[PDB]
């Protein structure tokens, strides 16, 4: 079900990606880091995601 | 904005291809115990950021 | 002080007690009732089902 | 031989069952003549008419009779002239009590034997009018600025302010005689103005502040205990028949004659008879409520307004300096939430070293003041109790105060008055506004729910003060053979084809105020917002509090900031209350039931050979004057702190529709609602409120925010003036922080022992940075010590527990009790004598008390004819099935030896008692008549989502799940607004099927018992530790002493409980409307193998479907035992004191049999029942699932 | 099945504390107890004959 | 001192892992049903005096 | 002299940026100016 999913879904998520992309310059792309670890991921939220 | 798919008929599916029993303890379970769609935005937001 | 004898008798003269009755008889009553006319074809009855479990 | 003796006790408890429904039944035959007549239920014939005024009824089964009740026909009254009537009576001053109100004949009659043994009572003095009153009156107006006071605005009613020229307090009123000033020219700003301050003064006041609503006839009570041979009753009676002191009650409403508050002088006195004999005071303990119940006679709540500063002054330093060692707890594992009380040894000698600080001078004033008032010995008892040893009758002389001040019941200030008077540092906003914001955010990671906008309209369904509602008219009719031909009326009762048969009709027209029936009636309201909601006035509410506490007044917010609060602010109070296992003590949640395991931490230090511990404990009142201006606002910054993390918003509040608002919207507004001030009426007067508000669930994370912003400065103040001045620094250990209240445990950080110069410093708080009166408060007001704490009226005192005192049942708010079925009451009565035995009662004393108030109970009337049932209720199923001698195990009713006969038709008629058709009739017939009432916007979002066939798998259908299904939803959706309305008229319709279907034989056929099990017990060993409840009944202490006590973290959950919370933590997975409850039903009612097909039939997304399926499988024993009781009345204290989990099973319990995990447990709380009934007596049993010897001959094991 | 891990609370490390000096006292005690009883049997008793 | 945790958590493994019926009866039934922590601090003496 | 807010405000930016109770509620500021007396020292 999740690479059904995945395969089904990508289209849209690609387009999200590259509005947003637009947004940041290209310093910005290849300076910022994840450093403080705010953003990370329980391992519930990974398998019901998907 | 996300579309409301309701995933009855994923999860049907996964309970045949797995034989789920209400009166015994599979793994299925466990997978299928803690689906928590409450984070989903927040780990849509981190898939766009990586 | 016969009625004591008696229960305490019960309890050898079967190999159940009761709560493995009631377990038991949880399993049985109410299935064969709510289940379809097609599954109803092919399930033993509740009656059955009491006597093949005691 | 303990099945032996345990068969004895049954037997015991069998006899007793018998005596007390005999006496019961004898105490009757007084009240109403000898029963005439033994009618038997089914094979006697009688036609409702000529049965006699009093009968009873019995019932036949296998060739013996039981005893089912009694039956009064209030036709044939003349029977009751045998025994009262007016003839009798011939003493003058009786006469007039019998015209003011029949009811108090009987007793009119016994006290003329009284009058007749010679003995005559002399009348007593009434205090007069005290003129100053006339200065105390202020008329507001918009002339004199509202008397320059910013709360009030636009009022229309008088206020009783403190005046040079008038008398102390007030508000508090007076007992006066009537005969005082019908009309009294007033002086305000024109001088014209005149009050008729009689008409007010007897009419509003004695209503809304000293209201009075005995659980029974108040005139039946008095004639059952005011025995006149009392001292005390002959002293209240030399105030009520002397002097000519009359009072009556009509309605709901109480009628004076010639004194205010003269019904106030029956509380106290049936009070004072009461609590005597609850507490079984010693001789001195007698004396000193002799002088009390003297010196209060002659205002009943005034004096106790007067002592209320000097008795709290005095209790606060009880047992301050005890020589006694007391009780030892270990300190181990005292900074986690697994903490738990445990014995260790302590060397004897740690009293000298122990210290608390006593603000002697204060002492010595509240002494002098006691004196003053001429309350000599309970002054003498007090300062006694202060430095002596810890003993029980000791620690009932130390309380004897609060019993004291208890006298009054419920007395409130006057309401415009209480309005206006609880109406009216740049590092205390930054740690308030930073606690908030890190409050926010825990609950905004935690339950994120709230933000999503498809979310918005389930969290509002599942979550008042609206303007606007609906209202229902309509005529209920129902045909009654119960009535007579001359009660028959053109208005209400018509006489039908039928003979003997009648229609009654009830007109009732009445608006869905509850907040459900308003939200699916009128969504709307709670939806839209318009900014010009947070200026719209809404209606307040009073309560009352037993004691003389300050009255408290509830100020809802309006729907559509209710919504918002509910998407916002909800998720920081849901996080608060959560506190689990394995967290520290200084955590958010640990931070801020059951006494001991509450207080532990602090029972632990006051008991304990280490000093360095101490307990500090602050209670902060009359900060909402401090709650207004800055730190409203440092909250409101806290609260919009979280706007950064989402994205749409808008600079300025906006009107909004909340399912499409963006979350920084509604966190503006809440923000807005939280720093505006908000306006609230009631009375006529109208106040503005810019600090706390007193907003529901809103309160709480306010003031313990603050709180724990005054403790951090103060500590960190106290640690740079012991750098400053050379002394040992403190360490804060553990803390509890509920409302205004806080206790915490600091730990000297060097072991020094603590020092009187380490208390003052600390006490003293903000010195040299504010005025010298806030360091006086703050003295009176906080104690610290290692001897004795106090918190939330839970006292501690070396290792040991006290509770409070002001708990009774004979004079409720509202009146409720009055409105209630008799199962209703009779587990009301049930509920408080339990609570009554973990606390200064005894089984003896709550026992005696308990059947007396059963003796008095009004009983079931419909018509002109009365119901009363047998006493042995209590044992039948249905209600708590009690033990007499061990009442705190219900439903143990079912092992007594009854006779199998008897037992079946007790269930019966327990079964018939209570009835659920009169409500179906009821909304089935508001339904016809007015329509549908939900909104559309609930139609349409209650369809079915799961795209799965309603028919199912052609399985059977029940009732049930096509009520809850979403296809058939919108008419199940009106019964619940249809449920929301309660009248008369229902209980009286209950109440005539009960008398019809009693007595035309027909008895509902009781529903089975889900576990029953017969237990063999043999002997064992102890497990448990002495109880810190010292004044506890021996029972539950040795209750205590082998098995355990119980903590928070190993207490049981109910089902319903966790189904609701699954529901909740995942709003979307089910429609909003499914409650645990109806689940829970829907799936005790089909087989287990198809309970899946069922949830996709309710339409339970996965995530919800398989938790409740567990759950289900897990805990369906509770659910089944009790599910033919309700439970909303029962809050078993005694009961949930003991250890009965996982953690004393396998010590107590022995089953071998292979069982499935619900029916496992149920079958283990069974023989947990003969455990503790075998534990209540001292000894420590294990049962087993099979007799020891069954033959004489043969013998078994395992 | 259920062993939990140990936590060291300070109470516990004192609670040790106090222990050991307890010991001490008590293995100085009994020494003293054991010597002076040597001490009396010499000079009390003398050898046992059939 | 120790921690405290719930023997849900290791009970469901042993669950998934075995076949449980509510029904049936089997041997991981038995080393369950007489799963008692109330002795463990006797053991857990015990241990450390091994 | 010594300021709780800053305290305060470090505790809740770290606690954000990554539980952390396990050494945040440990933290007290009782003992700076002996500690700082030190650093000079040393």
């Known amino acids: 079900a999740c690479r059904d999913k995945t395969s089904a879904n990508w289209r849209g998520y690609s387009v999200l990606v590259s509005r947003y992309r637009s947004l940041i310059p290209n310093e910005l792309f290849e300076s910022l880091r994840n450093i403080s670890g705010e953003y990370n991921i329980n391992p519930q939220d990974e398998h019901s995601f998907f | 904005p996300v579309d409301a798919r309701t995933l009855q008929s994923a999860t049907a599916a996964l309970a045949a291809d797995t034989g789920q029993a209400v009166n015994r303890a599979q793994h299925v379970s466990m997978l299928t115990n803690r689906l928590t769609t409450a984070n989903a935005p927040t780990v849509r937001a981190i898939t766009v950021l990586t | 002080e016969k009625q004591k004898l008696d229960k305490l008798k019960l309890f050898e003269t079967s190999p159940f007690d009761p709560l493995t009755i009631k377990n038991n008889q949880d399993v049985v009553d109410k299935l064969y009732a709510t289940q379809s006319s097609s599954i109803q074809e092919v399930v033993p009855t509740k009656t059955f089902a009491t006597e093949l479990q005691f | 031989d303990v099945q032996e003796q345990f068969e004895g006790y049954l037997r015991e408890e069998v006899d007793l069952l018998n005596k007390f429904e005999d006496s019961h039944f004898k105490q009757l035959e007084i009240f109403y003549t000898k029963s005439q007549t033994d009618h038997v239920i089914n094979k006697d014939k009688l036609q409702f008419n000529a049965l006699p005024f009093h009968t009873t009824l019995y019932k036949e089964i296998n060739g013996k009779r039981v005893r089912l009740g009694t039956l009064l026909n209030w036709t044939k009254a003349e029977r009751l002239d045998t025994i009262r009537h007016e003839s009798m009576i011939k003493d003058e001053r009786l006469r007039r009590l019998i015209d003011f109100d029949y009811g108090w004949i009987d007793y009119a009659v016994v006290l003329q034997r009284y009058l007749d043994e010679g003995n005559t009572i002399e009348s007593a003095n009434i205090l007069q009018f005290d003129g100053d009153f006339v200065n105390n009156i202020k008329h507001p107006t918009q002339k004199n600025n509202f008397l320059d006071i910013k709360v009030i605005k636009e009022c229309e009613t008088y206020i009783l302010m403190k005046d040079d020229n008038g008398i102390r307090d007030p508000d508090i009123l007076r007992a006066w005689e009537l005969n005082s000033i019908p009309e009294v020219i007033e002086l305000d700003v024109d001088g014209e103005t005149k009050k008729f301050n009689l008409r007010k003064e007897m009419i509003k006041r004695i209503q809304d502040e000293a209201p009075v609503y005995f659980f029974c006839n108040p005139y039946r009570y008095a004639v059952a205990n005011l025995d006149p041979n009392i001292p005390e009753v002959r002293l209240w009676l030399e105030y009520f028949i002397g002097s000519e002191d009359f009072f009556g009650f009509n309605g709901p409403n109480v009628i004076v004659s010639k004194s205010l508050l003269a019904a106030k002088r029956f509380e106290v006195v049936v009070n004072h008879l009461r609590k005597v004999a609850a507490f079984e005071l010693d001789v001195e303990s007698k004396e000193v409520m002799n002088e009390w119940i003297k010196y209060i006679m002659i205002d009943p709540v005034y004096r106790s307004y007067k002592n209320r500063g000097a008795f709290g002054n005095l209790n606060q330093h009880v047992f301050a300096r005890t020589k006694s060692e007391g009780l030892s707890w270990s300190l181990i594992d005292i900074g986690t939430t697994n903490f738990e009380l445990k014995p260790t040894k302590k060397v004897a000698g740690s009293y000298v070293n122990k210290f608390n600080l006593v603000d002697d001078v204060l002492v010595e004033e509240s002494l002098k003041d006691l004196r003053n008032e001429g309350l000599h010995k309970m002054a003498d008892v007090t300062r006694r109790m202060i430095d002596a040893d810890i003993t029980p009758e000791n620690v009932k002389k130390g309380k004897l105060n609060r019993l004291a001040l208890s006298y009054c019941g419920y007395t409130g200030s006057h309401s415009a008055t209480a309005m206006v008077k609880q109406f009216n540092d740049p590092m205390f906003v930054d740690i308030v506004k930073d606690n908030m914001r890190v409050y926010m955010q825990e609950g905004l990671q935690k339950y994120p729910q709230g933000s999503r906008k498809s979310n918005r309209l389930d969290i509002l369904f599942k979550g008042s003060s609206t303007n606007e509602h609906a209202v229902v008219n309509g005529r209920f009719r129902y045909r009654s053979e119960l009535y007579r031909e001359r009660d028959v009326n053109s208005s209400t009762v018509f006489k039908t084809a039928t003979p003997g048969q009648y229609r009654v009709v009830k007109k009732i027209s009445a608006k869905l105020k509850s907040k459900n029936a308003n939200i699916v009636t009128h969504p709307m309201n709670f939806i839209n917002f318009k900014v010009d909601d947070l200026d719209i006035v809404v209606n307040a509410g009073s309560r009352l509090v037993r004691g003389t506490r300050a009255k408290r007044i509830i100020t809802p917010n309006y729907g559509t900031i209710y919504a918002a609060s509910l998407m916002t602010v909800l998720p920081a109070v849901r996080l608060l209350s959560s506190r689990a296992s394995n967290m520290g003590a200084l955590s958010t949640q640990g931070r801020i039931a059951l006494p001991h395991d509450v207080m532990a931490p602090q029972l632990a230090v006051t008991s304990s050979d280490d000093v360095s511990k101490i307990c500090v404990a602050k209670d902060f009142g009359q900060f909402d004057t401090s709650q207004w201006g800055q730190i409203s606002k440092a909250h409101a910054d806290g609260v919009r702190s979280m706007k950064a993390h989402y994205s749409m918003g808008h600079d300025t509040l906006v009107d909004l529709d909340l399912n499409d608002a963006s979350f920084a919207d509604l966190l503006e507004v809440t923000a807005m609602s939280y720093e505006r001030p908000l306006k609230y009426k009631m009375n006529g007067l109208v106040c503005e409120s810019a600090g706390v508000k007193s907003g529901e669930l809103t309160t709480q994370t306010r003031n313990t925010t603050t709180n724990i912003s005054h403790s951090t400065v103060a500590l960190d103040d106290y640690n740079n003036r012991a750098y400053r001045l050379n002394l040992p620094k403190l360490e804060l250990v553990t803390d509890n922080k509920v409302g205004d209240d806080s206790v915490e445990v600091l730990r000297v950080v060097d072991g020094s022992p603590l020092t009187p110069e380490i208390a003052k410093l600390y006490v003293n708080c903000m010195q040299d940075h504010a005025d010298k009166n806030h360091l006086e408060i703050s003295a009176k007001r906080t104690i610290v010590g290692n001897n004795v704490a106090e918190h939330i009226k839970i006292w501690v005192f070396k290792g040991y527990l006290a509770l409070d005192v002001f708990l009774d049942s004979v004079t409720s708010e509202k009146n409720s009790f009055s409105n209630l079925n008799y199962l209703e009451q009779v587990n009301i009565l049930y509920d408080m004598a339990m609570t009554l035995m973990i606390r200064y009662c005894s089984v003896q004393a709550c026992m005696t008390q308990f059947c007396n108030d059963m003796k008095l109970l009004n009983g079931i009337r419909a018509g002109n004819y009365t119901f009363i049932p047998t006493p042995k209720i209590i044992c039948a199923y249905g209600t708590p099935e009690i033990c007499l001698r061990a009442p705190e195990i219900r439903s143990f009713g079912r092992y007594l030896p009854i006779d199998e006969d008897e037992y079946s038709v007790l269930n019966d008629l327990v079964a018939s008692l209570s009835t659920n058709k009169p409500k179906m009739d009821f909304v089935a017939q508001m339904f016809e008549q007015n329509g549908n009432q939900v909104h559309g916007i609930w139609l349409d979002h209650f369809k079915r989502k799961n795209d799965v066939n309603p028919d199912g798998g052609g399985i059977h259908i029940s009732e049930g799940l096509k009520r809850l299904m979403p296809e058939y939803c919108e008419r199940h959706l009106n019964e619940l607004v249809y449920k929301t309305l309660d009248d008369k008229v229902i209980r009286d319709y209950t109440s005539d099927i009960i008398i019809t279907n009693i007595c035309k034989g027909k008895l509902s056929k009781a529903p089975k018992l889900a576990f029953f099990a017969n237990f063999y017990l043999s002997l064992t060993g102890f497990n448990g530790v002495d109880s810190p409840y010292l004044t506890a009944d021996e029972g539950v202490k040795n209750v205590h002493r082998v098995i355990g006590l119980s903590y928070r973290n190993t207490l049981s959950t109910s089902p319903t409980a966790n189904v609701d919370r699954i529901l909740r933590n995942n709003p979307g997975s089910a429609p909003a409307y499914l409650t645990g409850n109806d689940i829970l039903g829907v799936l005790s009612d089909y087989p287990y193998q198809n309970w899946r097909t069922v949830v996709e039939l309710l339409d339970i997304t996965e995530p919800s479907a398989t938790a409740i399926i567990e759950v289900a499988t897990n805990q369906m024993h509770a659910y089944l035992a009790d599910k033919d009781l309700n439970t909303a009345n029962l809050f078993d204290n005694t009961s949930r004191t003991y250890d009965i989990s996982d953690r004393t099973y396998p010590k107590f319990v022995n089953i071998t049999s292979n069982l499935s995990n619900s029916n496992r447990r149920g079958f283990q709380l069974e023989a947990m029942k003969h455990i503790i009934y075998m534990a209540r007596r001292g000894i420590a049993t294990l049962a087993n699932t099979h007799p020891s010897k069954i033959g004489n001959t043969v013998y078994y094991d395992y | ?50």
Do not use: C, H, M, W
């Open chain 5, 1 to 50: 099945f259920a062993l939990a891990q140990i936590n060291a609370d300070d109470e516990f490390i004192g609670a040790i504390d106090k222990e050991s000096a307890e010991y001490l006292d008590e293995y100085a005690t009994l020494a003293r107890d054991i010597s002076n009883s040597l001490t009396l049997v010499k000079a009390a008793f003398g050898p046992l004959e059939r």
